[PDB]
Amino acid sequence: FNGLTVLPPLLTDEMIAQYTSALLAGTITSGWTFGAGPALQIPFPMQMAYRFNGIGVTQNVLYENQKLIANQFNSAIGKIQDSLSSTPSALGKLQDVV
Amino acid sequence: YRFNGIGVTQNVLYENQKLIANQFNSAIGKIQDSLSSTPSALGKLQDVV
Amino acid sequence: MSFPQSAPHGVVFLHVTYVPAQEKNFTTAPAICHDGKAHFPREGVFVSNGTHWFVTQRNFYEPQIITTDNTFVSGNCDVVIGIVNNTVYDPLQPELD
Amino acid sequence: GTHWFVTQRNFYEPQIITTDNTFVSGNCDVVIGIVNNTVYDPLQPELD
Amino acid sequence: NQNAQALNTLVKQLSSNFGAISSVLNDILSRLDPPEAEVQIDRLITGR
Amino acid sequence: NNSIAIPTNFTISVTTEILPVSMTKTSVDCTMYICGDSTECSNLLLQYGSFCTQLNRALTGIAVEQDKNTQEVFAQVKQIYKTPPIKDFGGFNFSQILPDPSKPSKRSPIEDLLFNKVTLADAGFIKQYGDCLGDIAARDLICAQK
Amino acid sequence: YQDVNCTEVPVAIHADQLTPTWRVYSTGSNVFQTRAGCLIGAEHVNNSYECDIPIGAGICASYQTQTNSPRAAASVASQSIIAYTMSLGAENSVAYS
């Protein structure tokens, strides 16, 4: 009651999540090649073959280690999800704004 | 070079020489028209001063 | 490339970019297993036109003839995923044998 | 002189115009200021 | 230079009155009484 | 899991992006603003220390930074090169991004619009109404708004 | 003297501050009309630099131990290269080919 009001966002937390979903699905179905111009189809194995060729690791190595990379990736993502769950403190940088 | 440099073969420059020029030449036309029609963007200049 | 333009107390850039306009779908293979040696293209991927396989990069369709000189050997049939059994033509033996 | 060389834009380093150091595409009628000259093949005389 | 000048400028602002007729916080405390002291203090606090 | 989309056509597009670089070397004389010619005001002003001097110094320093922000963007190449005397860009046809010397200022058809569609309001470029002293010409007539 | 012409350059015009018309002088001398006012104590020279001490509106001065530069008359045949409109470097010849 001290002349304190709040303005609603235009692009809402949910709309932001929808945009995120679009971005997630883009990187997965079309690589980066949706960020400009019509989306190109490219499956995920082939998106890695180019992501790797681009740092100077061949396609053969990607495949040779297919199963390893997948396990490493899956685990990293696991640990991330799990860290957020274990302690809220990881998001301090957001809590600090609030 | 500029073509190869973005991962598109120089072959395109040549095969599509007409296509490429036309598009650029025209884009310059459109820019002049855009700026006259929507000089709204020049607000980024005007407001600062 | 870009070209600069002046404006009072500012700069306006004209950025020349290549943006795709029309895509078309092709069937691919990352490699061909020629005789147990897997052949990858020097650049690009193998594409089928429904009959013949060619090498082309993902940014433009340029069906290049598949020949050993435009590939390199790395791995074998059992290393590479999505690999297809096909011929990589030797460009040298036809003029000697 | 009268010889042609492949060189980079960042340093003059003449290299010979062979069918190996070059590749073929298109035709001569879509390249503006196309020059007609001889491209060398190190292999061809060994095929006789 | 700015570190030092900022600190030096801060010290020099001690000489300000900001509408008071004394800058010397100690003499105001010790020599003046409320009818005058409060007046100068209200003005030095806001100013400072 | 076995197919990709490969471009069969493309467009070469030109994107126009407008950015600011600097502002005019604006200055306020704190003393003139507050006291003008008032001797007794100055006496009372000195009581606020160098607070007022700092205000003047800060605006002077900004003015200095504004010349540099402009150099930083445009003085990057201090050598003056002239336009292509020859326009044989092969398939391309442009001069319309280049200065037209026949114009009052060596501005391109595009810069003509970037200038005439930008009106800036600045004191000293805007002259007084009623004038005080000096010719309306040039910057011969003094202007300091009110 | 910010934003005035070089005909009414006095500190006080037909008045004083109980001190000589300028400040201790009653004349300025070395009066150069600039695009930021009128510069007194410096004269225009036809020998330019890529600036030293900027004044504004393409106007600059330089002091290079010239045994007074913004406190002397102009010369273009001796080192009294004082105030000038700045040059944007030199031209560097190139032609499209």
Side-chain angles (χ1 to χ4, degrees):
Chain A
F1 297 100
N2 291 307
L4 271 57
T5 70
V6 65
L7 285 72
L10 181 62
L11 188 62
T12 67
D13 288 346
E14 291 177 355
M15 287 179 176
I16 289 168
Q18 290 176 32
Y19 271 135
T20 302
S21 295
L23 291 169
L24 286 165
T27 53
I28 292 171
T29 60
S30 60
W32 63 89
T33 58
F34 72 97
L40 301 178
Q41 181 182 64
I42 183 168
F44 187 82
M46 292 184 73
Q47 291 167 28
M48 291 190 294
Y50 283 100
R51 290 172 188 163
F52 278 69
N53 187 64
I55 63 165
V57 176
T58 61
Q59 300 89 344
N60 183 61
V61 172
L62 171 65
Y63 291 125
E64 185 175 1
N65 292 281
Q66 182 72 33
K67 290 179 180 178
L68 176 63
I69 290 168
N71 286 340
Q72 289 174 339
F73 179 94
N74 289 340
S75 295
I77 294 295
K79 288 179 180 179
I80 291 166
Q81 183 178 314
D82 287 346
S83 295
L84 292 172
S85 180
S86 295
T87 176
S89 65
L91 302 178
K93 287 184 174 181
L94 300 175
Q95 188 64 56
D96 177 60
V97 174
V98 177
Chain B
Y1 182 84
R2 289 188 182 109
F3 275 50
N4 288 340
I6 61 163
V8 177
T9 179
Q10 67 184 291
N11 292 342
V12 170
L13 180 64
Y14 298 114
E15 288 294 308
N16 292 282
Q17 185 74 59
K18 290 180 180 178
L19 176 65
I20 290 167
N22 285 341
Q23 288 173 343
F24 180 79
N25 294 339
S26 296
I28 291 168
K30 288 179 180 179
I31 289 167
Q32 290 175 60
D33 287 347
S34 295
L35 289 171
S36 180
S37 295
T38 57
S40 294
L42 296 173
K44 291 180 178 181
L45 304 176
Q46 287 181 115
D47 288 348
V48 170
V49 175
Chain C
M1 60 184 175
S2 306
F3 298 94
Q5 302 286 315
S6 66
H9 294 92
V11 65
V12 176
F13 295 99
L14 308 177
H15 302 295
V16 185
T17 64
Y18 176 123
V19 59
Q22 175 70 61
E23 83 279 358
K24 183 172 180 178
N25 296 308
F26 299 90
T27 298
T28 64
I32 292 172
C33 194
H34 178 70
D35 62 4
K37 294 186 285 292
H39 285 250
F40 281 86
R42 288 177 189 275
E43 178 177 356
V45 300
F46 290 112
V47 296
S48 175
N49 69 348
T51 54
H52 294 289
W53 285 86
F54 300 94
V55 177
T56 184
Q57 179 61 278
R58 72 179 293 173
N59 297 319
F60 54 87
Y61 190 69
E62 182 175 83
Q64 298 178 0
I65 299 300
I66 298 169
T67 189
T68 60
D69 287 349
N70 291 332
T71 66
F72 64 92
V73 175
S74 179
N76 61 58
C77 297
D78 294 318
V79 174
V80 182
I81 306 302
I83 192 162
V84 300
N85 297 310
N86 217 316
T87 297
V88 179
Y89 288 92
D90 186 299
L92 297 176
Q93 183 178 21
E95 299 295 321
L96 299 178
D97 288 344
Chain D
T2 59
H3 295 262
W4 293 75
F5 299 93
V6 182
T7 181
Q8 293 182 303
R9 291 182 177 88
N10 297 320
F11 188 78
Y12 180 52
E13 185 185 84
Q15 301 181 1
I16 301 301
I17 302 172
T18 70
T19 61
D20 295 305
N21 290 333
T22 64
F23 68 90
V24 176
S25 67
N27 56 63
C28 301
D29 294 320
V30 297
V31 179
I32 301 170
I34 191 68
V35 175
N36 293 284
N37 210 296
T38 297
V39 178
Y40 289 94
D41 190 282
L43 177 62
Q44 184 67 55
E46 300 295 332
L47 301 182
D48 287 325
Chain E
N1 290 347
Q2 286 183 37
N3 282 161
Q5 291 171 334
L7 289 171
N8 289 341
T9 298
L10 179 64
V11 169
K12 289 177 181 178
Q13 285 288 109
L14 291 172
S15 67
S16 297
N17 290 329
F18 304 107
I21 60 171
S22 181
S23 63
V24 181
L25 292 168
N26 289 337
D27 283 348
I28 291 168
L29 175 64
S30 298
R31 303 176 70 192
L32 303 177
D33 219 29
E36 182 70 27
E38 285 181 354
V39 173
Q40 291 184 29
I41 292 168
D42 281 347
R43 293 179 190 182
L44 290 174
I45 291 171
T46 296
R48 286 175 187 272
Chain F
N1 61 11
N2 63 13
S3 61
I4 71 176
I6 301 175
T8 61
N9 200 0
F10 65 96
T11 300
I12 304 303
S13 297
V14 184
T15 298
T16 301
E17 295 174 359
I18 296 83
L19 292 93
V21 173
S22 64
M23 63 182 178
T24 57
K25 289 176 76 169
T26 304
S27 178
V28 174
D29 177 326
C30 176
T31 298
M32 188 65 73
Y33 178 80
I34 298 171
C35 297
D37 62 359
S38 175
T39 298
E40 294 300 309
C41 177
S42 295
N43 290 341
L44 292 173
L45 184 59
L46 288 172
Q47 293 185 7
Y48 296 79
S50 62
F51 183 86
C52 190
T53 299
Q54 288 178 54
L55 294 174
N56 284 342
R57 289 178 182 174
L59 294 175
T60 299
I62 290 168
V64 171
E65 291 295 309
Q66 296 314 304
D67 284 342
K68 291 191 293 183
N69 283 347
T70 301
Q71 289 169 331
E72 186 67 21
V73 176
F74 297 99
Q76 292 179 0
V77 179
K78 295 186 179 180
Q79 294 179 301
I80 303 301
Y81 296 96
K82 297 180 180 179
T83 58
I86 296 167
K87 302 298 188 293
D88 182 342
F89 302 126
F92 286 58
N93 185 1
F94 59 97
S95 63
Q96 290 181 53
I97 64 171
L98 299 181
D100 179 340
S102 72
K103 297 292 180 65
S105 178
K106 294 180 180 179
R107 292 180 184 274
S108 73
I110 293 171
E111 287 170 318
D112 284 344
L113 293 172
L114 299 179
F115 187 93
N116 287 335
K117 299 297 184 182
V118 174
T119 299
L120 306 180
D122 287 281
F125 302 76
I126 298 170
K127 294 296 195 293
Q128 302 293 151
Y129 296 84
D131 300 349
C132 182
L133 296 170
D135 197 303
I136 191 63
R139 296 179 73 91
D140 290 352
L141 167 62
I142 193 69
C143 176
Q145 292 186 331
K146 300 298 184 183
Chain G
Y1 189 0
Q2 180 180 348
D3 292 322
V4 301
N5 68 39
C6 289
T7 61
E8 296 178 355
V9 298
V11 171
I13 300 170
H14 297 297
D16 66 66
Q17 296 177 26
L18 306 181
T19 195
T21 301
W22 181 256
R23 301 295 280 161
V24 295
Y25 304 94
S26 60
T27 186
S29 76
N30 297 321
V31 181
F32 162 31
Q33 178 73 66
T34 75
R35 288 180 289 274
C38 178
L39 183 63
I40 301 90
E43 288 190 332
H44 186 279
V45 299
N46 294 322
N47 293 324
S48 65
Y49 299 116
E50 300 177 358
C51 292
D52 181 0
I53 301 172
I55 297 169
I59 303 296
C60 294
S62 184
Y63 165 76
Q64 297 185 32
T65 64
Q66 297 184 72
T67 67
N68 300 334
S69 175
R71 180 175 178 181
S75 178
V76 297
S78 65
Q79 298 292 296
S80 194
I81 302 171
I82 301 171
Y84 42 90
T85 296
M86 73 179 290
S87 295
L88 305 184
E91 294 179 355
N92 187 26
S93 176
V94 72
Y96 178 79
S97 175

